[PDB]
C-alpha cells in the first residue's frame with residue numbers, strides 16, 4: 059500500500075506498526091522456538107515443547123535465519139500485510155556493524171521484496187520522538203544500555219557509551235535478592251513472575267542510603283503481590299535495590315560505571331561549546347528507564363557531576379517505553395523523508 | 408573611487424525604506440547584539456530604540472539633510488557617559504568561546520511564546536546573536552527569522568511535536584551553517600590568518616596522519632581563504648556558498664584516506680559532512696622517528712613556505728599533543744629560527760640558536776604531554792581516577808585534601824584544553840599558567 063511500516067527489532071521485544079500511528083500495533087518477544095517451530099508469544103506459551111533462541115543479543119542481530127523467521131512473523135501474522143506493498147523503516151543499535159546493516163538491507167530487498175526501506179539508529183529516533191534534533195539519549199532496554207550524544211541528527215560515534223547491563227540483568231538480580239529474602243524464584247515460570255514484580259513494584263530511590271534506613275523499620279514502603287496460585291507475598295526494599303543496580307553496577311559484580319556516569323562521560327567526549335545542549339536535552343528511552351523516580355535521580359546525579367552553572371533537564375515522557383518506535387513513526391511519515399527511502403531500483407544498482 | 412560623504416546615511420536609509428520599520432528594527436537588534444556580545448538585553452534594546460528613532464526621522468523624504476549627521480554624533484557622545492544606557496567595549500569585540508545560550512524545551516518555548524510573542528522574539532534574537540555573533544550577519548538574520556517562523560507555526564499546530572521535527576529537519580542546513588560559521592570564524596578571529604592557516608593544517612594532519620602533505624595543504628589553505636573572505640563579508644551568501652563547496656573538495660581528497668573520513672563523506676548533505684569532519688578527534692598517530700628542525704639553508708633560502716608547511720605537517724602527524732599546544736609553540740619557534748638569516752654571521756647564530764630551540768621545543772612537548780596525560784585515551788571519570796593515582800605517586804607527601812584540589816584543577820584544565828577543538832584565546836593564557844607548575 060502507501061502506508062510505511064516501522065519495525066523496532068529489540069533484544070527482548072519487537073515493536074512493529076504503521077508510520078503515522080501513535081503507538082506500535084504489535085509488541086511481542088523477539089524469540090523463536092524450535093520443536094526440540096513458533097515465534098513471539100506463542101513460542102513462550104509453548105516453550106515446554108520447544109527450544110527458545112533469541113536472534114538479537116545486546117541489540118545486534120546474530121542469527122539471520124531466526125531473524126528472517128521473526129520478520130516473516132511480524133509481516134504476515136502480527137501486522138497481516140504483504141511486504142512487497144510497504145516501504146519499511148527498520149532500526150539498528152548504535153555502533154551496529156556496517157556488514158550487519160548491509161545484510162538487513164539485502165534480506166529486506168531480496169527475501170521480502172520490499173519496495174523501499176531505511177535503517178535508522180534507535181537512539182536518534184528516541185530524540186526525534188520529542189521533536190528535537192540535538193541532545194543526549196540514554197536508551198536502556200532488555201539486553202543493552204547506551205548513551206548517544208546527537209547534534210542536529212548526527213550521533214557522535216567517538217562519544218557513544220555502551221553499558222552491558224539492562225532489563226534482563228535487573229530481572230535476574232531481583233530474582234536473586236527475593237530468594238535471599240526467603241522466597242524461591244528459579245524456574246522459567248518464576249522468572250516471568252519476577253519480571254512482572256519488577257515492572258509493577260520497583261522504583262528508583264532519590265537517596266538510596268536513606269531509603270534503606272526508612273525500610274529498615276516502617277512498612278510504608280512495602281507492597282503486596284499476588285502470585286499465580288493466589289499466595290500474597292511482600293516486597294520491601296527489593297523494590298528499590300533492584301534498579302539501584304543501574305547506578306551501582308557493583309550490585310551484580312560489574313566493575314563498570316553506572317548510567318549517571320556513562321551519561322556524564324558521553325557528554326565529556328563532546329566539544330565544550332555543545333555540552334550545554336546535551337545537559338539541557340537528556341532524553342531517556344526504553345523499557346528499563348520506566349522506573350518511577352529514575353528521572354529525578356538522574357537529575358540529582360548529573361547535577362552533582364556537572365558545572366554548578368549548567369542547566370540540567372531530563373526528558374522522560376510517559377510513553378518513553380516506545381520512544382524509538384514512535385520516533386520512527388513520525389520520521390517515516392514526514393514528506394521530506396520520502397526522498398531518504400532506499401528504493402529497490404537504487405538497490406538493484 | 409572613494410565613497411561619497413553620505414555613503415553610510417544613504418545605505419541605512421535605503422534598507423529602512425526597503426525593509427520597513429519593523430523588519431529594520433529586527434535587523435538592528437541582531438546587528439547590535441552581534442556588535443556588543445556582552446551587552447545586556449536592556450542596554451542593547453535601548454541602543455536599538457535610539458538607532459531606529461533617528462533613522463526613521465533622518466531618512467524621511469524632505470527631512471533635514473544634516474539630521475543624520477548630528478543625531479548619530481550625539482548617540483556616540485551619549486555612550487561616553489560612564490554607566491550609560493548603551494553597551495560598550497573596553498572598537499573590537501572578543502569572540503565568544505563559551506556560549507551559554509540554551510534552547511528551552513518545546514513546551515517551554517510554546518508557553519513563553521504564547522504569553523508574550525514580541526518579547527519572546529526580541530529576547531531570542533538578542534540572546535542568540537550575542538552568543539553566536541561571529542557568524543556572518545546575513546546568516547544570523549536569516550536563521551533567527553526562520554527559527555521564529557518555526558516557533559510561530561509549530562506551537563499553534565494540531566501536532567506540535569510532529570511539526571517541530573519537520574521544521575527542525577528543514578532548518579538543519581541553515582542552523583548548522585550559522586552555528587559552524589560562528590565557531591570557525593571565532594577561531595579565525597582569535598588566531599588571525601597566518602596562525603589560522605597553521606592551526607588548520609595541524610588539525611588536518613592529526614585527523615588524517617596517513618595522508619601526503621599534498622592531500623591536506625590545499626584544504627588548509629582553502630578553508631583559511633574562505634574564512635578571511637566570508638567571515639566579515641557583507642555579501643548575502645559568501646559563507647553559504649563557499650562552506651558547502653569546501654566540503655566537496657575535502658571529500659574528493661580524503662574520502663579514501665581512512666575509515667573515519669570514508670564514514671563522514673557518506674553523510675547525505677554538505678553540512679552533515681562538515682559537522683562530522685569538524686567534530687572528528689585526532690586519529691591514533693602512527694609511530695615514526697623524530698623530525699628535526701629545518702636546516703639553516705632551507706630556512707634562509709627564498710621561498711621557504713613549502714619547507715615550513717612540510718615541517719609543520721611532519722611534526723603534527725607524529726606528535727601526540729593537542730592542536731592548541733602545537734600552534735602555540737610552533738609559531739614562535741619558526742619565527743625565532745628565522746631571526747638568524749638577518750645576521751652577518753648566520754651560521755654562528757644557527758649553531759647557538761638551533762640547539763637552544765630544539766631543547767625548548769622538546770621540553771614544551773614533554774610538559775604538554777604531561778598536562779594532557781591519560782585524557783584522550785580514557786572516559787572522563789576513569790581519566791580522573793588515573794590522574795589521582797599518578798599525582799599520589801608523584802606527591803606521597805600531599806594530604807588527601809591537597810591531592811583532591813590538584814586533581815580538580817588539572818582535570819578541569821584538561822577538559823578545556825586537551826581536545827582537538829579547544830578554545831584558542833582561553834587556552835593560550837591557561838597553558839601559560841599551567842606550564843609554570845611543571
Ligand SMILES: Nc1ncnc2c1ncn2[C@@H]1O[C@H](COP(=O)(O)OP(=O)(O)OP(=O)(O)O)[C@@H](O)[C@H]1O
Pocket residue numbers: 067068069070071072116117118198199200201202203224225226253256257258343344345346347348349379
Ligand atoms: N515499567 C517497567 N519498569 C521496569 N522495567 C520495565 C518496565 N516495562 C518494561 N520493562 C523492561 O524493559 C525491557 C523491555 O524494554 P525494551 O523493549 O525497551 O527493550 P528492547 O528494545 O527489546 O531491547 P534492547 O533495546 O536492549 O535491544 C524488559 O527487561 C522489561 O522487563
Ligand SMILES: [Mg+2]
Pocket residue numbers: 067068069180199344382
Ligand atoms: Mg530497544
